[PDB]
Amino acid sequence: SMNPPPPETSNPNKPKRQTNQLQYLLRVVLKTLWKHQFAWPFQQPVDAVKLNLPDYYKIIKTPMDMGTIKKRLENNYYWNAQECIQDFNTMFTNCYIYNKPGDDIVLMAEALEKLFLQKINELPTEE
Ligand SMILES: CCc1c(C(=O)n2ccc3ccc(S(=O)(=O)NC)cc32)[nH]c(C)c1C(C)=O
Ligand code: NI
């Protein structure tokens, strides 16, 4: 069994910019989630080899994780907040699709998503 290459965090051909909203997403949203007690399972891509989950990348075809997101933010990879938010949302949805309701990983994702949504609710208006 084999892990795919992680999602790209650099691409010179991709259009990108810095925006106060993206700055907020790194400085407030990502930092708050990263430090959370339940962050660790989401801080790097799922290692399906180590975890013996040969089915994972056969069903999750758009994997995403906060390590990848943190890197994209730090490299100013995104064009807008909406792209970054989509990545977070893909991360959560993937978790809910693959795992059973009530699994620890799901409970952990739900807690993080609740905090995520609280912070997104106060996304500053774009300057
Ligand atoms: C349930 C597996 C999983 C994790 C996960 O990372 N883990 C959950 C238990 C667990 C134990 C050790 C290690 S580890 O040894 O690889 N250390 C980081 C990782 C672990 N994250 C996500 C998003 C998922 C799924 C399938 O949704
Ligand atoms: Ni726009």
Curated annotation (Swiss-Prot):
Chromatin reader protein that recognizes and binds acetylated histones and plays a key role in transmission of epigenetic memory across cell divisions and transcription regulation. Remains associated with acetylated chromatin throughout the entire cell cycle and provides epigenetic memory for postmitotic G1 gene transcription by preserving acetylated chromatin status and maintaining high-order chromatin structure. During interphase, plays a key role in regulating the transcription of signal-inducible genes by associating with the P-TEFb complex and recruiting it to promoters. It comes from Homo sapiens. The chain holds residues 42 to 168 of 1362 of the full protein. Phosphorylation by CK2 disrupt the intramolecular binding between the bromo domain 2 and the NPS region and promotes binding between the NPS and the BID regions, leading to activate the protein and promote binding to acetylated histones. In absence of phosphorylation, BRD4 does not localize to p53/TP53 target gene promoters, phosphorylation promoting recruitment to p53/TP53 target promoters. It comes from the Eukaryota. The NET domain mediates interaction with a number of chromatin proteins involved in transcription regulation (NSD3, JMJD6, CHD4, GLTSCR1 and ATAD5). Belongs to the BET family. The record marks 99 as: Acetylated histone binding. Residues 17-123 form the Bromo domain. It is linked to Cornelia de Lange syndrome 6: A form of Cornelia de Lange syndrome, a clinically heterogeneous developmental disorder associated with malformations affecting multiple systems. It is characterized by facial dysmorphisms, abnormal hands and feet, growth delay, cognitive retardation, hirsutism, gastroesophageal dysfunction and cardiac, ophthalmologic and genitourinary anomalies. CDLS6 inheritance is autosomal dominant. A chromosomal aberration involving BRD4 is found in a rare, aggressive, and lethal carcinoma arising in midline organs of young people. Translocation t(15;19)(q14;p13) with NUTM1 which produces a BRD4-NUTM1 fusion protein. Interacts with p53/TP53; the interaction is direct. Interacts (via CTD region) with CDK9 and CCNT1, acting as an associated component of P-TEFb complex. Interacts with RELA (when acetylated at 'Lys-310'). Interacts (via NET domain) with NSD3, CHD4, BICRA and ATAD5. The interaction with BICRA bridges BRD4 to the GBAF complex. Interacts (via NET domain) with JMJD6 (via JmjC and N-terminal domains); the interaction is stronger in presence of ssRNA and recruits JMJD6 on distal enhancers. Interacts with NSD3. Interacts with NIPBL. Ubiquitously expressed. It is found in: Nucleus; Chromosome. This is Bromodomain-containing protein 4. There is a cross-link at residue 58 (Glycyl lysine isopeptide (Lys-Gly) (interchain with G-Cter in SUMO2)). JQ1, a thieno-triazolo-1,4-diazepine derivative, and I-BET, a benzodiazepine derivative, have been tested on tumors with success. Treatment with GSK1210151A (I-BET151, a I-BET derivative) has strong effets on mixed lineage leukemia and promotes myeloid differentiation and leukemia stem-cell depletion.
